[PDB]
Amino acid sequence: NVLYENQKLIANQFNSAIGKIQDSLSSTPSALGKLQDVVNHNAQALNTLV
Amino acid sequence: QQFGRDIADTTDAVRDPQTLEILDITPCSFGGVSVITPGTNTSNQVAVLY
Ligand SMILES: *[C@@H]1O[C@H](CO)[C@@H](O[C@@H]2O[C@H](CO)[C@@H](O)[C@H](O)[C@H]2NC(C)=O)[C@H](O)[C@H]1NC(C)=O
């Protein structure tokens, strides 16, 4: 019963959170460290292989 | 210089000794071959895949 009394408020909060994580995804390049970690490990394995 | 290298430390560029034209060294086509078959219990047609 609590959803329909602040629907605009929770919609605005959802939009603000979406914008916040959109900013935070490009805020730093260290937030995806697993992906470039495994990519760098594969590239270094190939580099030491050759 | 007479010959160049890369991170892989392979001969990729070389200068000719007879003239002054810089060339490249690139290996030609290579790789394992693959096959496509539906099994001998159904048919015998196969498709070679490079
Ligand atoms: C080795 O001999 C060749 C002979 O062809 C020389 O090539 C000539 O170089 C001159 C230099 O300006 C050019 O004008 C000619 O057109 C070249 N000849 C041909 C057929 O293209 C070459 O320079 C010589 N290399 C050295 C180190 O003496």
Curated annotation (Swiss-Prot), chain A:
Residues 7-50 are annotated as: Heptad repeat 1. It comes from the Viruses. Subunit of the fusion protein that is processed upon entry into the host cell. Mediates fusion of the virion and cellular membranes by functioning as a class I viral fusion protein. Contains a viral fusion peptide that is unmasked after S2 cleavage. This cleavage can occur at the cell membrane by host TMPRSS2 or during endocytosis by host CSTL. In either case, this triggers an extensive and irreversible conformational change that leads to fusion of the viral envelope with the cellular cytoplasmic membrane, releasing viral genomic RNA into the host cell cytoplasm. This is Spike protein S2'. The gene is S. The chain holds residues 914 to 963 of 1273 of the full protein.
